[PDB]
């Protein structure tokens, strides 16, 4: 997966397409727009190789990441979702909503300590109010 | 990937995994970053390895190359502000004040590890 290859791109050090400028950030913007197109109209499969192919090219982007990660949590793919959520967190630290959604895969995973930890975290640090409010109504039931 | 199909004894991995560390802590750093990334090979999960190769690119001052594996290393680990911390040294070398102060700052914000949380706001004190 998208993980993988951003390993193996890492071992390798050889040139990636990101290093040349292959791709114009115009022409990422609308195949980001594309993904989501395929994605609102429930072309789920497309949306994803679309979301993969761009998180081939640029990997460490939070929005190419939370469009992905937000794919394999509807396909109940928690694993995949919970370790994508939390790049997008790492790249982008002040956004709580991965953690909030890091939360919601680790309580299917059945880690629910896991899940608690992520679920105090959106308390204690978000200023997002509505957020806060969906993760504590998660505590309660933990 | 290799590991998957247990390609070699879990004791093996452990003891390539501490030859990787003894060429690392003798200064042998191209020994170290050929075995880093035979571990990376075979189980690009394993964050420990991850973690060792990103040791291996910061100390040869590929700065971004090892920012961007402490972020893979950060996300499989979901208990570890280490890599956050080593992430936040990268960026002051990128100069980045901004962007590593936010990697401090995290540590503190998040982190159950007194000594590393003593070690992130060292440099909190530092940046200007
Ligand atoms: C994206 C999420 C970010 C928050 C992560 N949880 C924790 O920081 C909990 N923890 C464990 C040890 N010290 C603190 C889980 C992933
Ligand atoms: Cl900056
Ligand atoms: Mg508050």
């Known amino acids: 997966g ?3 290859t951003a390993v193996i791109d890492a071992i ?3 040139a990636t397409l990101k290093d040349i400028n292959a791709i114009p950030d115009d022409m990422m913007d609308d195949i980001y727009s594309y993904a989501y197109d395929f994605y609102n109209k429930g072309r789920i499969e497309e949306a994803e190789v679309f979301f993969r192919f761009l ?3 640029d990997f460490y982007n939070v929005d190419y990441i939370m ?6 949590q509807i396909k109940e793919q928690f694993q995949q979702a919970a370790d994508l959520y939390a790049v997008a967190f790492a790249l982008g630290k002040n956004d709580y909503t991965p953690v909030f959604h890091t939360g919601q895969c680790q ?7 896991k899940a608690k930890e992520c679920f105090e975290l959106v308390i204690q640090h978000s200023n997002d109010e509505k957020l806060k409010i ?3 109504s998660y505590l309660d039931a933990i």
């Open 67 to 72: 469009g992905l990660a937000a794919i394999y």
């Open 55 to 57: 998180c081939i090219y």
């Open 134 to 136: 969906k993760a504590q």
């Open 2 to 4: 998208s993980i993988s």
């Open 12 to 14: 390798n050090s050889g």
């Open 107 to 113: 309580l299917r995973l059945k880690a629910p300590l």
